[PDB]
Symmetry: D2
Subunit: 124 residues, 4 copies
């Protein structure tokens, strides 16, 4: 199995109150759903990503990333967010991320297409 | 089908000479392989992502994103990159992205865990 | 005077234990010194920046930014960090930032020149 | 003098058609004005920043950064941009940057406060 397959798989919550439901596969896959507490979003969106299934054993975190395109059966916000970060195990397990949200825009507006931020996910 | 299913599917090349091989599914999925011309990487890595399969029709680009975890059968760089951007169709089709590369690090080094950059992909 | 001239001027501390000493001028200027608890840095470095001296009065934060080039009389790390963020007044005043650290590198290494992160500064 | 004092001082133009007028001081200071071809901006804005006045001599670029707060006598966009990058000398001298634009927002909107992008400046 991936070293942190069981540690990563499950339900996570960020500081905005969003809900990140993920399954980590033995092959390095991340699959699941994302529900954002903010923005032009309602209900669950498909996500997919990858993680390092054989991380270092020196106390370093486990690198990972995932994408949500903000289209589902309810809404289409013509945008996608990618989260890049690491899982940190332990009693207070965390996934610490930085993210890039890109909106589909015309070429004249490309300069203002991308938001950057940071989300921390916990199991509680 | 996704509006830009055929436009996105195929082989793309960025300004570093890296090769991005992707299939866009009707459901919004991106699957394929990435081969980086630079860094701690050799041969192909699995990628997965998402794209807006019903973009706006006002000339705006098509938002998308994908992730590579830098582990394959040859090397493990304990890191993952996410690319966030948009596909722009036309005679000179492009995927314009910004990216976040996170390395698995100890908590004392978390402040220096993440690189940011920008890649432009073309069909030639 | 700037609306938050007095609120911004003073000594601030971030989550790494770094010390940000700043004077906000009536004209929108920020001047002062930065001392980083981490990285290739020792003692104080010159900083300069700008802030919105007439912010909105609807509860929004006060936008600002500053730069440190990491050369002083002790060390030269051939790099510069810019912090971009906002000051949020109140009992628990904060400056919330995201930052970009660029290292001087050869053109072959330009893709790995820039780190991104986020620092929160408090008065305690 | 700074190694690239003369190389940096002058008028620069980016890919959007914006105009960056800068003087590099022997002490590492950057001062000047910025005029953006895009966004909520008109005429010139004050800028200030820092650069490495004693860069490496191995062909590496010269790290630098600067800030503009988007208030002048004509408009106040309640925002600030920081550019972080490097100057690359030679026949086709360039300043390659990544930038963070933060808007002053209420705490409920802090997640969408910051844009990220990249500008390349040339002498022509
Ligand atoms: O909301 C969305 C989809 C939901 C995004 C939720 C984000 S993911 C990163 C973060 N972690 C999280 O848990 N939740 C948030 N996609 C278009 C994102 C439009 N803006 C923001 C909201 C909005 C809704 C309606 C009308 C205008 N805005 C982005 C701001 C912006 C920046 C630059 C130019 C123009 N607009
Ligand atoms: O290379 C990797 C995997 C390959 C990454 C390729 C990147 S994806 C974004 C971009 N688009 C692309 O087409 N190609 C590049 N993963 C660890 C990334 C270590 N550094 C860089 C190289 C290196 C190799 C060996 C030893 C040291 N470095 C990152 C620099 C850094 C930043 C902060 C702290 C420490 N190190
Ligand atoms: O430390 C510096 C100057 C100090 C930087 C302090 C940072 S500002 C943002 C943050 N807020 C803060 O309060 N403190 C930190 N400038 C070169 C920054 C080299 N690396 C990190 C340390 C290091 C010291 C010696 C040898 C190798 N590293 C950056 C990692 C990197 C990324 C990509 C490619 C290569 N390296
Ligand atoms: O324009 C400004 C000041 C000018 C900014 C110019 C930028 S600096 C980086 C770049 N290099 C350059 O040469 N030129 C551009 N400051 C508020 C920036 C509001 N948005 C964009 C324009 C706008 C004008 C009026 C109404 C709405 N927009 C930012 C988009 C955004 C993102 C997230 C949430 C909400 N909005
Ligand atoms: Cu290893
Ligand atoms: Cu973080
Ligand atoms: Cu948007
Ligand atoms: Cu705006
Ligand atoms: Cu639509
Ligand atoms: Cu771009
Ligand atoms: Cu690394
Ligand atoms: Cu380093
Ligand atoms: Cu106003
Ligand atoms: Cu922040
Ligand atoms: Cu460095
Ligand atoms: Cu490295
Ligand atoms: Cu040196
Ligand atoms: Cu760049
Ligand atoms: Cu804004
Ligand atoms: Cu918006």
């Amino acid at each position: 199995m991936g070293r942190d397959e069981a540690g990563i798989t499950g339900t996570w919550y960020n500081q905005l109150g969003s809900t990140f439901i993920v399954t980590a596969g033995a092959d390095g896959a991340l699959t699941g759903t994302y529900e954002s507490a903010v923005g032009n979003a309602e209900s669950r969106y498909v996500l997919t990503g990858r993680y390092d299934s054989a991380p270092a054993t020196d106390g370093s975190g486990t690198a990972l990333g995932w994408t949500v395109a903000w289209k589902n059966n309810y809404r289409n916000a013509h945008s996608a967010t990618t989260w890049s970060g690491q899982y940190v195990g332990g009693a207070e397990a965390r996934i610490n991320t930085q993210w890039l949200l890109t909106c589909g825009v015309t070429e004249a507006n490309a300069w203002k297409s991308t938001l950057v931020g940071h989300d921390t996910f916990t199991k509680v």
